[PDB]
Amino acid sequence: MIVLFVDFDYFYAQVEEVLNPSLKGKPVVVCVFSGRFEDSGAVATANYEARKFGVKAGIPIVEAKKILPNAVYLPMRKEVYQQVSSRIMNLLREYSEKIEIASIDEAYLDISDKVRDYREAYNLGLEIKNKILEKEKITVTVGISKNKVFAKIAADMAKPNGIKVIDDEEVKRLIRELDIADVPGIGNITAEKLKKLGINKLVDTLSIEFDKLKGMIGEAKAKYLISLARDEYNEPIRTRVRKSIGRIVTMKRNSRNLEEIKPYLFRAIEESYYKLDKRIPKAIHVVAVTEDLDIVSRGRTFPHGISKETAYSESVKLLQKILEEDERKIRRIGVRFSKFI
DNA sequence: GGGGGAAGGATTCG
DNA sequence: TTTTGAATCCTTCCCCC
Ligand SMILES: [Ca+2]
Ligand SMILES: [Mg+2]
Ligand SMILES: [Mg+2]
Ligand SMILES: [Mg+2]
Ligand SMILES: [Mg+2]
Numbered sequence: 085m086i087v088l089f090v091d092f093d094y095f096y097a098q099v100e101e102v103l104n105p106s107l108k109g110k111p112v113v114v115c116v117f118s119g120r121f122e123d124s125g126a127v128a129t130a131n132y133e134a135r136k137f138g139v140k141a142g143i144p145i146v147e148a149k150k151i152l153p154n155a156v157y158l159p160m161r162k163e164v165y166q167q168v169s170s171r172i173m174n175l176l177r178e179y180s181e182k183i184e185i186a187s188i189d190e191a192y193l194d195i196s197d198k199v200r201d202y203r204e205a206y207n208l209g210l211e212i213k214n215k216i217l218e219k220e221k222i223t224v225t226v227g228i229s230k231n232k233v234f235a236k237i238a239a240d241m242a243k244p245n246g247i248k249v250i251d252d253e254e255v256k257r258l259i260r261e262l263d264i265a266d267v268p269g270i271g272n273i274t275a276e277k278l279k280k281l282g283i284n285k286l287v288d289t290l291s292i293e294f295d296k297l298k299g300m301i302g303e304a305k306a307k308y309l310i311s312l313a314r315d316e317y318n319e320p321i322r323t324r325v326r327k328s329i330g331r332i333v334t335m336k337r338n339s340r341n342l343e344e345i346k347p348y349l350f351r352a353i354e355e356s357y358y359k360l361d362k363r364i365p366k367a368i369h370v371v372a373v374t375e376d377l378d379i380v381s382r383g384r385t386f387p388h389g390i391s392k393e394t395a396y397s398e399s400v401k402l403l404q405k406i407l408e409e410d411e412r413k414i415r416r417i418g419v420r421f422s423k424f425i
Numbered sequence: 426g427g428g429g430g431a432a433g434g435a436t437t438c439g
Numbered sequence: 440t441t442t443t444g445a446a447t448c449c450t451t452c453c454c455c456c
Contacts, residue, residue: 115443116443116444117443118441118442118443120440120441121440121441122440124440124441124443125441125442125443126439126441126442126443126444127443128439128443128444129439141438141439142439142442143442144441144442145441146440146441147441160443187438187439269437269448270437271436271437271438272436272437273435273436273437274436274437302448302449302450303449304448304449305448305449326446327446327447328445328446328447329445329446330444330445330446331444331445332443332444332445333443333444334443334444367431367432369432369433373444377441377442379433379434379435380433380434381432381433381434382432382433383431383432383433384431384432385430385431385432416443416444418444418445420445420446422446
């Protein structure tokens, strides 16, 4: 199996440079203004110029500005990015029927029927980079290898505007030298729990008792790692189907007065139904984020698809259930639909 | 014992 | 003034064979 991976570079920012070239070279930060107060909200992503000086995904727009008072600040235009993306993705489908769109900016291509070796792949990666650079003027990073994981790993080692290949040999190496927290799907909480066991590389998972690992990071993640450690990882590139759609919004002011929260819940639903677009959900969850930033949600499954009228009524019940079962005030309120027919 | 599914906190990645 | 927001992942609880 041969996997070619495409990761668009600093995507939201880049699309913004493409829409306004007079931005190339300058620091650009794509934000998500929450609305509570002047510049309240986080940073979605910034081009590399802005990353150098410490501005990056996650930090507050408030901090961001103290550091780069002149960097160009722009509101996240998700819609636009999503359309530009789809176009890019299509260009990809012209290189393999087996395509796994993973995110608005990542895609996996099983090209084990279009090349015979990594060289022929490399040349394909180059072809793909340039074809995307012409058509959409967007630079990307390619990662090629034996399975979706390492190909991604490859691409991280190269971005931006790069292209790398990890041969079955470098895999044996990485399995031995690569920091485990750098392995896809392994976040901070699991990275930590792994260092707390002395496990720092993929290999290390092989020298530990299984029921021990499983008890610390769960059965699924336990198996997932062991399988990589053994280079026994092969997972088909499959069409990924979104399994749930939702929306959650930050209220102007914390509260727990049912009638004050409703309007938001309802807008959250409307925006969610628009997004559902012909998909009929059989499950609804109302999600609340309390003042201390904790998350509390209550859902319910129906033996039939849910109409917008039903969502409205059921969501209020679930919201009440929340207020009853928790005393904290709500900061952000939202809804989530799933289990489509 | 375990199928199978419903719920809700947990974790990941932005 | 904090820390936006979207979606799956994991785990437990529960009914019934
Ligand atoms: Ca990217
Ligand atoms: Mg991404
Ligand atoms: Mg990590
Ligand atoms: Mg909690
Ligand atoms: Mg529970």
